């Protein structure tokens, strides 16, 4: 789990958020796997990942990456989309399979808090829209 980095356990707040040792983080270990690997080799692009093994202390993953600067991927237009600059650091913005699941973007009434982006839906629904002609 994700223990708070607060020093000596002090939280300096209301007695509501006084817990340190029992917080669970908001992204899967799979997302951290892409982050630590997609950052070591910046010349590559993270495509996907999957579970391979595990133990009491670690969770093992093998990440598949593509090279957009390689001429093989530059041609063979099936995979040209990975060469576009808009796909730079896809996993950093949570655009992978685990990314789209960790932030929970899916179709259905079960996903209304996060259906088009948690912040964007909040701002869209929490705002005052004033027209020129006040009806």
């Amino acid at each position: 789990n994700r223990k708070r980095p607060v020093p000596k356990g002090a939280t300096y707040g209301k007695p509501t958020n006084q817990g340190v040792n029992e917080l669970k983080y908001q992204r899967s270990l799979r997302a951290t796997a892409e982050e630590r690997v997609g950052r070591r080799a910046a010349n590559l692009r993270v495509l996907n990942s999957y579970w391979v093994n595990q133990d009491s202390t670690y969770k093992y993953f093998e990440v598949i990456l593509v090279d957009p600067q390689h001429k093989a991927i530059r041609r063979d237009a099936r995979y040209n989309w990975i060469c576009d600059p808009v796909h730079k650091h896809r996993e950093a913005r949570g655009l992978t399979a685990t990314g789209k699941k960790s932030r929970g973007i899916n179709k259905g009434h079960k996903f209304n808090n996060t259906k088009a982006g948690r912040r964007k839906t909040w701002k869209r629904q929490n705002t005052l829209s004033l027209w020129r002609y006040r009806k």
């Binding site: 701002k123 929490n126 705002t127 005052l128 829209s129 004033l130 027209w131 020129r132």
Partner: protein
């Protein structure tokens, strides 16, 4: 605070509502800016009808049954009934759902 005879108003203006206020001064300016987009489309889209033709399809739910609205496409049964194949409607400018 409250007093006298008034309705009990609940105004949701407790957050920092001022930093997010989308005023719509443009409106008419955007209206002209969208006429330009529509006008320029009519030229480079060839002498085409612009919008496609949408099916006549019944509205859902209980209240909206007396009226019939426009759908998104002609399925495949109607497309096959017309004789033309599925993908030929898209080229000829008929939407398929």
């Amino acid at each position: 605070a409250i007093s006298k005879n008034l309705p009990i108003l609940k105004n949701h203006f407790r957050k920092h509502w001022q930093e997010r206020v989308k005023v719509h001064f443009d409106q008419a300016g955007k209206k002209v800016s969208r006429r330009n987009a529509r006008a320029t489309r009519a030229a480079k889209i060839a002498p085409r009808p612009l919008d496609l033709l949408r099916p006549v399809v019944r509205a859902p739910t209980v209240k909206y049954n007396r009226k019939v609205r426009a759908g998104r496409g002609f399925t495949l049964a109607e497309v096959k009934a017309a004789g033309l194949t599925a993908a030929y409607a898209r080229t000829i400018g008929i939407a398929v759902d």
